[PDB]
Design a protein around this nucleic acid. Structure first.
Length: 59
DNA sequence: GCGATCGC
DNA sequence: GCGATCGC
C-alpha cells in the first residue's frame, strides 16, 4: 500500500526530511506487535531506504 | 530469531 | 537471493 502522510526521517545522507513513503506495511512475528515499515526514496541521492513509521500511521 | 517488502 | 528496516 502507498502512503500519503509525510514522515519525519533521517536520510542515508544524514539530512532530516519529510517524505511520503512509496510503500508501507506491518512487519511483525506471531504474538508480538512488531513495527510498521515504510519504503522511502531520498530525493537528493535517488536511493531507496527503509525506515520505521509511527505506531499510528495508517497501513 | 521472527515478520514483509523490494531495489539491487 | 539478500540487505536492511526494529521491538520483542
Amino acid at each position: 500500500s502507498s502512503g500519503k502522510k509525510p514522515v519525519k526521517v533521517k536520510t542515508p545522507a544524514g539530512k532530516e526530511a519529510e517524505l511520503v513513503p512509496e510503500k508501507v506495511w506491518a512487519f511483525a512475528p506471531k504474538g508480538r506487535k512488531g513495527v510498521k515499515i515504510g519504503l522511502f526514496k531520498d530525493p537528493e541521492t535517488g536511493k531507496y531506504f527503509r525506515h520505521k513509521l509511527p505506531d499510528d500511521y495508517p497501513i
